[PDB]
Design a protein around this ligand. Structure first.
Ligand SMILES: Nc1ncnc2c1ncn2[C@@H]1O[C@H](COP(=O)(O)O)[C@@H](OP(=O)(O)O)[C@H]1O
Lengths: 242, 7, 253
């Protein structure tokens, strides 16, 4: 059908993807934070309000989500889902990302440790109250890519690393635009310029490192995971994160 | 349940 | 058509109706707090997890929600909805209930007035960020009762008042159980005994002691903070808004 998903584990730079996409579809810059939710709405955001786009709607519709493709609620879109964009980033960075957010100044030993301890035991953010239904890191990727057809039988998938977007914003964005059939290529330039790190932090406010530090043991812990027998190592390898 | 915040 | 809603506005007594409803179906008590959520799942809570009950099942299903009936997400159950139990409570007491749930002792007028005054301006809890998609008190009521066919053309409604339930627990649970055809009636007296006030507090604590997912303690009238606020409520109560219209009708004037 006509439904399209920007799927991603939390902290994989989904906001920015959405921002840019909102800017291309509109042509105009993003007038600020809620603009992002209006453009590529986040599904969780909508369900909180009781909002939910209709299944089989006759014009193309773009939503975002951190759910695993196999969550019962996405079932209503089982048939009408055509396209999935799966945005993926170094789980090393996602983890470091939750920290900055959760507040902590990088030299708070027992505070970083614990979250890191947890992330590694869970293989993602299962024990982090901010999100729900997102599953673990491999689980999330698996369900939206290799197993997408178990949830969305009519879908096509374009997987995309956060790091490639950072290395070539316009090239990679146009790969996403092209795949979704939102038109040109010319627009793609301005949209990148309309959602740059600066315009971003400005839109957040006028609304309202690596494993070195404390590593020795943790660093090890992580690396053992990253070269483990598990689905976490499978995807790390497969996406160059190993 | 399933309730909001922030407390 | 086998889907059934316990619709209610926040703080109408939903957990209790919910808890007695589970007890009657299980046949035994509810030993733990998420047993309530297991029993008569609250829609909002299911969505947080990305869970959602099947649109169109073969045998009867019971959900709870604080959503207005018209909220788009419910569009999915437009034909599968057979029955609505709309639980209603005095709005004066719902407002008081939130103060108790927020902690706040009956002395802190500043603290209580703020909630009270916000409550009056909004005709309900719309500004309280604890829930979303509920609308104002009358908005909710209208959508489940007078308007229910705009959202569920096939549905039949029972209404039940919190206060009726306190006065006659077993007689009132019976109306709800007979309405929903859950069966017997000898079961009824038992379900009430299990989900008592006392039973409920202890059942909350035991869960809470076994570090469990529970909803800070969770389990009077107008004179104390007011005059300014007394008149303010009164004016709303006996005024010409739809709130008044419903307050009059369920006998809260
Ligand atoms: N077993 C029971 N019997 C009577 N009232 C109950 C009860 N369990 C909970 N309640 C009351 O229901 C209200 C909460 O409603 P909800 O569960 O929908 O939020 C609170 O009212 P009060 O705070 O006025 O006492 C709560 O104490």
């Amino acid at each position: 059908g006509s439904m399209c998903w920007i799927a991603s584990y939390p902290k994989a730079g989904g906001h920015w993807l959405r921002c840019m996409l909102t800017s291309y579809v509109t042509g105009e810059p993003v007038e600020t934070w809620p603009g992002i939710q209006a453009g590529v709405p986040h599904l969780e955001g909508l369900l909180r309000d009781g909002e939910a786009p209709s299944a089989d709607p006759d014009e193309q519709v773009l939503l975002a989500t951190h759910f695993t493709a196999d969550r019962p609620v996405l079932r209503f879109y089982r048939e009408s889902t055509a396209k999935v964009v799966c945005l993926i980033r170094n789980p090393r960075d996602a983890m470091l990302s939750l920290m900055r957010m959760k507040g902590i100044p990088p030299e708070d030993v027992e505070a970083c440790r614990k979250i890191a301890e947890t992330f590694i035991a869970d293989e993602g953010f299962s024990s982090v109250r901010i999100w729900a239904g997102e599953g673990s890191w491999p689980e999330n990727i698996r369900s939206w890519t290799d197993s997408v057809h178990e949830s969305f039988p009519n879908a096509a998938v374009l997987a995309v690393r956060y790091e490639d977007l950072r290395k070539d914003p316009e090239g990679e964005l146009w790969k996403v635009v092209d795949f979704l059939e939102l038109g040109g290529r010319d627009g793609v330039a301005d949209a990148v310029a309309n959602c740059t790190l600066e315009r971003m932090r400005e839109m957040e406010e006028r609304s309202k490192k690596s494993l070195k530090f404390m590593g020795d043991d943790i660093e090890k812990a992580y690396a053992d995971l990253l070269h483990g027998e598990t689905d976490f190592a499978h995807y790390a390898r497969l996406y160059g994160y190993a | 349940x399933y309730x909001x915040x922030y407390x």
